[PDB]
Amino acid sequence: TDLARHRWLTDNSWTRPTWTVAELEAAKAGRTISVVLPALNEEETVGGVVETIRPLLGGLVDELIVLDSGSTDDTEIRAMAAGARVISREVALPEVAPQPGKGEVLWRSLAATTGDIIVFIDSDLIDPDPMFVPKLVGPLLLSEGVHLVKGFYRRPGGRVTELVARPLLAALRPELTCVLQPLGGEYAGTRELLMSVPFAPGYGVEIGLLVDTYDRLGLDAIAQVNLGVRAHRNRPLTDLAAMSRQVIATLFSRCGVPDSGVGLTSEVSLVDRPPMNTLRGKLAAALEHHH
């Protein structure tokens, strides 16, 4: 089974993406690219992240959007000043009452974008690099059959990643242990995939998308690329335990394990949002390729 993981890494993993912006533009072939940054109270970093993507707008990148998650700091004005269009959760999907968590934000962004490719980038990154978006879309534009690209960082994984996500995947979806950073916030997906799957709530959205992509489209539909060396950032153990609890709930929900829904003495939801093509059928159909 290590031969399967080995062949995936040789074909679907890039430690040193060579691609230039110019060759990626030339390869778009009519497809459009939307970059979405979710943001809840990220005034200190959102501008910096937007600034590294902004020079691509009008070229490789067709839309640059910050999806504000109900911030009360200066996130929106700083994201605007850095050159992003700022869209609230309510504007993205007005007739559906919002609910908390990151998964909600990413899901609503599908109704407020037009890209055939959607790129997600966390807005709390303190060291964003301008080649993030090019490296994330490279496999989608130049490799047949890829629908989800996960950006990983070399270390100079994470405690939740190595103690929770990777060992649970070994137990329940063993082929997926080849994904280095399954919980990473930087990744890109096709409209065809993202429009057609449920979105898990809160901190479960990344692992839910990975497992749903694996089941529906297969291992070769997933790729991964190295975005650069980044050290781990400190997070309190209570936040990490809360994130673990929701990663567990979403994995269990995708495998049919009855999860009690009981949190840690912490929020945990077992309810997905439905595929966006059920609420935006005409948008979704308009975005389906003729062939």
Ligand X SMILES: O=c1ccn([C@@H]2O[C@H](COP(=O)(O)O)[C@@H](O)[C@H]2O)c(=O)[nH]1
Taking alpha carbons only, the member of 207, 276, 193 closest to residue 243 is 207
Residue with smaller CB distance to ligand X, 101 or 198: 101
Q: Determine, following the binding rule CB under 6 A, whether residue 201 of this chain makes contact with ligand X.
A: no
Pick one of 260, 286, 289, 291: the residue that binds its own copies (CB under 8 A). 260
189 appears as a binding residue in the annotation: no
168 is a site residue for ligand X (CB under 6 A) = no
SS3 assignment, position 197: coil
Reduced to 3 states (helix: H, G, I; strand: E, B; else coil), residue 150 is strand
To the question of whether residue 5 is assigned a binding role by annotation, the answer is no
208 Cβ contact list (under 8 Å, min separation 6): 103, 197, 198, 199, 200, 250, 253, 254, 272
Tokens at 48, concatenated: 């910096």
Q: According to the annotation, is 158 in a ligand binding site?
A: yes
Size of the site for ligand X (CB under 6 A): 13
Does position 174 bind its own copies by CB under 8 A?
A: yes
User: Both tokens of residue 225?
Assistant: 């690329």
Provide, rounded to whole angstroms, the least separation between the CB of residue 91 and its own copies.
Answer: 33
By CB under 6 A, tell whether 124 contacts ligand X. yes
Q: Are 123 and 47 in contact (CB under 8 A)?
A: no
Nearer to ligand X, 185 or 204 (CB): 185
Element (H, E) at 49: helix 46-53
Calpha distance 86→66 (Å, rounded): 5
Q: Does the protein bind ligand X through residue 38 (CB under 6 A)? A: yes
Asked whether residue 123 is marked as a ligand-binding residue, the answer is: yes
User: Which residues does the annotation place in the binding site?
Assistant: 40, 42, 69, 101-102, 122-124, 158, 160-161, 203, 206, 233, 235
